[PDB]
Amino acid sequence: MPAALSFAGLAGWAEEDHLAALNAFRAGCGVSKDPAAARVCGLAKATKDLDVSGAKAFIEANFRVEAVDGGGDGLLTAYFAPQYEARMSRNAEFSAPLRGLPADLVVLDLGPFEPALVGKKITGHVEGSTFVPYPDRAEIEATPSDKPLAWMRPEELFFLQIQGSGVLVLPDGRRVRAVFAGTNGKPFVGIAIAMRDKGLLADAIRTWLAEHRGPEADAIMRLNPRYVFFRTVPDDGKEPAGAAGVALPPGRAIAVDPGYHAYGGFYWLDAAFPVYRRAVTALDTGGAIKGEVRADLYMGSGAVAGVEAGRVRHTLRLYRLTPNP
């Protein structure tokens, strides 16, 4: 069957928790740049105490259903806000330093040099009488850290670098949030394919790396030259924020390719032994999420979330729920 044009044709719409849908839109709309989305965001936040029937009606009277990519197939996976063990001091197991934004690193705007490049950027640092690209992972991992933010297991740092946010737990129960601070500007390279052609095979990557500290595993993580820097702040127990800078609503937010999807957009997932046909807001991304019909559904931060997220690998048809002009 081809893709729907309206809410009537949308399989799952009638059974959707329309309150959760409407709250998902509210969770994310304020981040939106579009002006037609601003009016609707405004009315949504104003209008409270709607029951499920009202919420369903509000959404239907204010949005249009617009298939993405003509209704073509892509992929739904899911992720959760991970909680990692850390130390404030290095040992054999917690051998990788969590590193803050280096003071030498510059994101250089290119517009002052060439109008044709206004709003493009490069990242590097001064070395001698010139300016060079910031070192890659391997070369950063080779200079010791002056003032490391914490110490982690290498494979776990590596994976928190992919997510962009997490919570670290010291043995004394101090919870510290690690918040994305910047990047060395190198492109992300997923290490799974290279691990495949070497014959050593998502949770399995982690487990292999973990069983082979260090130089074995170190050498393969280094195939990803993209290094992510953090800042740390005491966890206030709230949901983490994602790329868009807003508290992620559990089960109701997706990570997207930002080159295809603006943050704050309202979407409908049609994915299919569980089934995901629900409205979500786009509020995050990840170094590996690429493509148009591609969404990574945020499951939450607890234990239940960790378990449900790993179950999701679904054929996805995606739709924008576009606010009416």
Next chain:
Amino acid sequence: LSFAGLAGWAEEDHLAALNAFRAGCGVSKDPAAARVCGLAKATLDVSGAKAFIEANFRVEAVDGGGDGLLTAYFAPQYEARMSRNAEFSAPLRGLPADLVVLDLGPFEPALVGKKITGHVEGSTFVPYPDRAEIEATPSDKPLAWMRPEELFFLQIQGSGVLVLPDGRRVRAVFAGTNGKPFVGIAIAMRDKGLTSADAIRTWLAEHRGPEADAIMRLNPRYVFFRTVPDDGKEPAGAAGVALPPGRAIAVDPGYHAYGGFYWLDAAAPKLVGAFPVYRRAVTALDTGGAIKGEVRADLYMGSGAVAGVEAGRVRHTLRLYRLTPN
């Protein structure tokens, strides 16, 4: 194909042709050419040279005899002085040590092939100063001093010969840029009640000083140079040998070796005021960035303004012949 069947070979000035080869051959890495070079350095008049050439080279078409392109070029020539004076008030500046040109590709593959120019300031990198800012920075070690409006034109042309009062000549060779784009001044001048290059040069010369400077400043681009002392009658080409006017070509060195002796048969001019045919023997002694292809020649017309006018009128369909020794 022989010298009898060479359209033009009858009328050719064979003396100059041989002096072209002699100019010339000494730079060749071809044993056969060396043989003939030494042989010609010993041995004349207009009839004796025709004979000498007809007995020592054989004519051979290039690329089967396919059609290519003849253009021409010249060496601009300017007076200069080794000390400033209000006439020769603009310094010819070398490549600053702090100036850097960055390939952007290594930073962001999407920007492969792009470049920016600037210098390190503190812990960042800033755009290089424009013309107006460079001209307002006193010259530490100028390479020479030039009339400003003439430096301005040298900067557009990329290279030229400089002549001092005591007859010493230096070649001014392009060294780099401050990375800003050229901005023409004709229309800014025209919309001011002040249209060709000579006409702009005249005006700028007569209003030399603050007035002229203010409008040259509308062009933010700035070109830097290096100088090589060059005291031949004419300047040296890429082959290291001095170039005989009207008798030397620039070529693609991927196809044609320096010192090679060639015959040009050019016709079908594309421009107004052009000589209808070029038919002559010339030597390969130079190259340039734009001279690409096998049947492709840039004839060197000499230095100075006359050579420059002639050069601009060459655009002809070319059949290229090598005169191979033995």
